[PDB]
Amino acid sequence: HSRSESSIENFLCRAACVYYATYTNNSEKGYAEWVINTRQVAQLRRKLELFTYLRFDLELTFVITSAQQPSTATSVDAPVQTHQIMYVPPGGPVPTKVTDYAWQTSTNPSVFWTEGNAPPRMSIPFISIGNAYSCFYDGWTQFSRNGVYGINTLNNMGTLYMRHVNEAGQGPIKSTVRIYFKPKHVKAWVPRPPRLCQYEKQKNVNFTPTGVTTTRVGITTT
Amino acid sequence: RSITLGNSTITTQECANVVVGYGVWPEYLKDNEATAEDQPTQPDVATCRFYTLESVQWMKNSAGWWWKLPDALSQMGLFGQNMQYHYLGRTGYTIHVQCNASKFHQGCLLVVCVPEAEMGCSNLNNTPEFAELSGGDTARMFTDTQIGETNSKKVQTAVWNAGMGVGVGNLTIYPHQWINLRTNNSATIVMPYINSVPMDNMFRHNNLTLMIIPFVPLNYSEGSSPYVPITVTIAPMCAEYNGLRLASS
Amino acid sequence: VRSITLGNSTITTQECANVVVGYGVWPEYLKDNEATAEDQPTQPDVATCRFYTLESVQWMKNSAGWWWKLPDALSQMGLFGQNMQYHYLGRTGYTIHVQCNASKFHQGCLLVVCVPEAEMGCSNLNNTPEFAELSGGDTARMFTDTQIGETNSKKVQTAVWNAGMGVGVGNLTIYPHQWINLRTNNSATIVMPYINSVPMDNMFRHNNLTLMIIPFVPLNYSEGSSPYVPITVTIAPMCAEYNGLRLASS
Amino acid sequence: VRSITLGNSTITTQECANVVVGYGVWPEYLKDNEATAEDQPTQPDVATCRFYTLESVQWMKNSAGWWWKLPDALSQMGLFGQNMQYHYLGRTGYTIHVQCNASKFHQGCLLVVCVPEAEMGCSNLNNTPEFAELSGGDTARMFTDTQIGETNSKKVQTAVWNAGMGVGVGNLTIYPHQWINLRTNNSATIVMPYINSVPMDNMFRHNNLTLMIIPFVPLNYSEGSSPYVPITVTIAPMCAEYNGLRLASSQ
Amino acid sequence: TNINYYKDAASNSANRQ
């Protein structure tokens, strides 16, 4: 009877991997970085793109897993590994190395998490300049109707950096951080047709045309 | 009956029914929702009136047409003049697509108004050109086949994907009507201001895109007049302009 | 802009030409004051009272007319027919919907009539017509453009100007009827009540009603106008009752 | 004596004979609360809810038992079967009357049970039995006194002491049942309600119930006593409903 | 029983009801 599970809140409020990247133990410049967009993954992108304008808070879950890489030493002992995830809002200083001053995060929020514990989680508010997030943008970045065309003239959400706080281990360890978004308290407007053609690029709608549906033999075929 | 607005009074009426966007009638920006602190200019009659764009011909092969809305009336009268002179603008529209054939003709058009019709390219590693997306008082046309990859900056105009990578048969979610020549003569859609922000620049952002796509092609026996035109007439409604300054296209 | 619904079915009619309700009587069930059978009656309702569409026929410029025997029209069509086979007695009204559509460039006029007790005559005056000649289920039997020959042993005297009943065809209007004039009409609907001298009767042995479609003004049209104009009959039993359950009948 | 009357039919069942009313439930029509099928059902009433007498079978000194699937037992019986063919969904209770009468000089005992959802096993453990093996239209399929071998890919493992269901035959009493002890009994009457997880189900694809008559104490009698003791099953649909009218089925 | 522990509304659970 009830249409409860088909509410927008239930539809979108499930964690989804939006991106995942890797970094190395000592390395040299073994830090990772990610400009935050929601269009690199197909599943979440389609769910969000069923609507033109959205508004919601976010639940961020990080799943960080490491693995031993080959080494030449005798019996390398792994001490527990701690990681730092720093958020650099647009305009802030950017880490250029694993031992940069930016990592001090006096103002920039960041998480310190030790392996073997519950995955770290953070909620974040509605961070938009406008009165709603924009899923599509039929315009340009420059008033001369030139420069960039699409939603990447709007996307400016800052960067996300990843590093080992532990370091110098006698044997190398490679880590993989997986970012997960879960929209909370969602508000959607102007529904639009589901995506039909496979996604091609994260920064534009560009598609390769495909057929409307699967095919059958005859109109009376069953 | 008739629909009279600002010196212009199209009469195309027969009971019938005007599709009022998403159930919202266009209104001026409320002081509760605004941020631009300067007082707007509301030309009213001079701007909120029926501008009739160039007509196009519906052919037995025609795939469809589209117009970007701000850049369709961009050059038409005082609407265009205020548009050139102001940094910010906000308008609703009343769109009237007029097509008439005879009882011995047959065919059917989908007249839809897509908010935020971001369109893709044929060469997937670049975005289409401004002129490719836009046609001032000149409807741009969809294609009967997939356009070529080699084309550096062209719009993927294969109609069955509507240039947006979607199912053309699902464009009905956007406010729309059908012009079935069997039972129809025109389509009227009253669109409100659709945007994430209270006001936006009218050259940089085409908030809406009108699409006329024939789903059942035009046909007629030999003898019935063979030139069936489609005429688009759009009227701004509750137009507001903020941030007066120099002007430039 | 009107719809008539019965069971799983629904017919579309214009909100102008009303339904000819038999002899001013709407079909109803038998009441305990007019009945004789004592057994409780099966009344299948939705399974029986529904719009069964018979086979369509082609109306041509020379066509003389068509007829159907009613109990023996739906006799093999669905649960009406099944109950008809399994019960000794039955009772029904009908809603008959004759659908024919042409264009403004066509012309013609049909008489759609419901004859109660349409006892028909023979070609050979020394014999009674044959059941196969009189009856057609899902196979409309046809009137003739000419007198059939006396030589024919067991045939029906199907001369249209006598309606196969030895009467004046122009006087069939005494029976409930409508006209389908292609200029102004697309269909005709007649709701017939149960007409018989007894409260119930056997449905195989006695066809208490007979539908007749006779073109009084023939089809005509100019070259180019579509030449195939079909007529489709759709009948729906109403207030069906069955008594005397037994072994089935062929 | 008493008279059980359903439509055109009337049974004479002793006077003190106990009618076993299923799981304490008398069959009733579906309620608007528990339904989903939106089309108005057909309730034949007198034409369907009546006593169809199936084929009788002979009880001989070695008989192991008999069984019928119910929806597929009345499939060829009258207007019940006709509506069964013409409708997509059906729902029915039953009144089952198994009659056997011998003389004072005879002896024996039958278990008459109604197994809902009597999913049966195969002889070849890698296959499921065939439709004809599980089903016999008014033609009781028989239990066996012996194991059927792995050979015969598509048969029912009809060893009586497992009831073809992998259980102890002596535990079938959990299902509604009676005993026909020729010493003191003439018939058995069981009123079964609609037993299923869904409000309505198709009547060809799913046999909601399975009647079983298994002699637990074999027939015997002295020389001279009549040697032919038949058992006659008479089942009557009760509160039958059908939904989803359509073409008939070739089943 | 649902009590919110954080001073910021964004920290709350989803509006499931």
Next chain:
Amino acid sequence: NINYYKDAASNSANRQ
């Protein structure tokens, strides 16, 4: 009793 979860399936068994 006190239930911490919004869905009834999350509750403990009905043993009382």
Next chain:
Amino acid sequence: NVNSLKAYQIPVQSNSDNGKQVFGFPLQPGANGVLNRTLLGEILNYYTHWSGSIKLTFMFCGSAMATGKFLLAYSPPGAGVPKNRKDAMLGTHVIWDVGLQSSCVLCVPWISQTHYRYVVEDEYTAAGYITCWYQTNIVVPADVQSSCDILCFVSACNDFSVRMLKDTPFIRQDTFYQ
């Protein structure tokens, strides 16, 4: 036709015959290609269970002078797809006269053994077959086309719900889009 608007066009023509099924698809809103990519089918493909009635709107886009009559029938499962108009006529059917009603809406009812049905194909949760037949041949005048087209629209009725959220099979990825 699938790579063109011709897929949405149901061909209808003036004929010498009757019956003559115009189209037939199974009632699999989420599985069959006819419906799974519709708006309704797209939404159903994000859920596992569905239940409710379905609006099939048929619009005739022929000449204003054309007339005719069609039989829109929903035959529940259990019997094969209706082979002739006689067979289709027993199940739920509707007589649509093209001329008074340019458009006709058929509300396919929810006739199922269970409260819900699988969005994916399962012979247990069967839905039936939707067929259309000629009730009375398309009659056309002179000097106007005798072959016309029909458009079909799918929507959900007021009593339609979905359940058990899941991922759609339609979108696939092998690398992070950039």
